[PDB]
Amino acid sequence: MNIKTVEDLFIHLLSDTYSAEKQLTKALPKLARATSNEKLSQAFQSHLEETQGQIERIDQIVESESGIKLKRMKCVAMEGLIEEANEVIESTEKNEVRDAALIAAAQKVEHYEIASYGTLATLAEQLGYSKALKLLKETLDEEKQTDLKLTDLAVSNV
Amino acid sequence: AMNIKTVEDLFIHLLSDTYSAEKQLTKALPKLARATSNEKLSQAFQSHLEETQGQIERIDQIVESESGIKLKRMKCVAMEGLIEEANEVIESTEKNEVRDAALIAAAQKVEHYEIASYGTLATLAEQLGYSKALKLLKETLDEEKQTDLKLTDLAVSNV
């Protein structure tokens, strides 16, 4: 993290979010397998497909602006969120308690992303990145809908 | 490490995690308030501290409201990492609007970690029939969403 300008901050956070999404796609298959509820399992599989589209949006964002260039880095916060989900799996039997706990872990993941994309959209707008702003808002709305979905599942987990 | 056999245990685990997260956050907020030269953001950080104080008191009230809600001493590692990131922001920037932007971002990741946690706690409280916890948790949740919104206002106002 070496950041002097708003443009450097945008690149830094976009690079972070990019790493977070790639990590999350690696983890989602196991989350889908670890759940006993098939509706929740399919929500994890749907969320994987959506995350693929979101990573594609980042590529398009990079293409859209000269001097947007991603840095290779590991998003450590996402790394820890994913490990906490894996600790849930390790600490439970495959039942409705695991399900409740996996939804909770995944909503922290989604909320980390909701924050990140909200910030990215604000900064894109500030920097005059019009195409990027459009694409970032598309992801942000999807992240919000996924979280809502997960809440509906947590509530009908009774 | 964690051991969760029942919905009751899960709720205790997460309540305990959140309680640690809030205590850690109060330790961090004073430095965040000093680290910004923008007065409005500085004020938001001091307001957030006083608000978090009241949120910890709600958790004590939640704990008194139901027997067999007993908190476990644990360190919330996610909040620890989010606070570490805010501190790295301070060391990696000059004291200016760029720092402010980056601190607001770090603080919104904190708020959203708490929005998620409280949303889950309110769900499980309802399921468990902890009526008093439910209203307390919903109150904190509402405040957390307002704080995130105030921070968005400041993010956009940093232009």
Ligand SMILES: [Mg+2]
């Ligand atoms: Mg995503």
Ligand SMILES: [Mg+2]
């Ligand atoms: Mg997501």
Ligand SMILES: [Mg+2]
């Ligand atoms: Mg709080």
Ligand SMILES: [Mg+2]
């Ligand atoms: Mg908070």
